Amino acid sequence: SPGIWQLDCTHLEGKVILVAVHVASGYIEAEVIPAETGQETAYFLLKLAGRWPVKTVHTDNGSNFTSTTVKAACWWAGIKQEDGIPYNPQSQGVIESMNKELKKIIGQVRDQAEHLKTAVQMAVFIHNHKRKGYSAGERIVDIIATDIQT
């Protein structure tokens, strides 16, 4: 559980926002990319795994699951690449609501930056710091610290 992440790809302004969600905490990292490719996804996961102890990634679609570029990055970073089939039907709902929230926040900050990438990073910040009480940033650190003491 401490090491499980889910990939999520959403669209805004003709661009693609790639999101990784730490499933247990709801903490996120995100980036804006021109299009989802294997190379973009592979690079994103490499960054993520250097920053948090990523054990398992539930990939966002079959193309990223298949991609030998993505598989090579997961091999390098010691990540178990898994499908993202929503065996628990609540998964679809949670991701959809997260995408909606993120787009809402992006609109609220959209005027405080020229470029979408900036607005997306502002949205990451607001999402991770929002107390709902603890924040997602607090939950992820608490979860992993609890794990390290095991």
Query: Does 73 interact with ligand ZSW (rule: CB under 6 A)?
Result: yes
> After what residues is the chain interrupted, C–N > 2.5 A?
132
Query: Does 50 interact with ligand ZSW (rule: CB under 6 A)?
Result: no
In the complex with ligand ZSW, the residue whose CB is nearer, 4 or 32, is 32
| Strands (E) located in the chain | 4-12, 15-22, 28-33, 56-58, 80-82
Query: Does 43 interact with ligand ZSW (rule: CB under 6 A)?
Result: yes
Residue selected from 4, 94, 116, 142 as contacting its own copies according to rule CB under 8 A:
142
Query: Does 75 interact with its own copies (rule: CB under 8 A)?
Result: no
Query: Does 112 interact with its own copies (rule: CB under 8 A)?
Result: yes
Residue selected from 112, 148, 149, 150 as contacting ligand ZSW according to rule CB under 6 A:
112
- What does 77 interact with, of Cl ion, ligand ZSW, its own copies, none (CB < 5 to 8 A by kind)? its own copies
In the complex with Cl ion, the residue whose CB is nearer, 17 or 54, is 54
End-to-end CA distance of the chain: give it in Å, rounded. Answer: 13
Which one, of 75, 7, 1, 83, lies nearest residue 44 by Cα?
Answer: 7
Decide: residue 55, CB within 10 A, 0-12 exposed, 13-18 middle, 19+ buried.
middle
- Written as six digits, the tokens of 57 are 């990634």
Q: How far is the CB of 74 from its own copies (least distance, A)?
A: 12
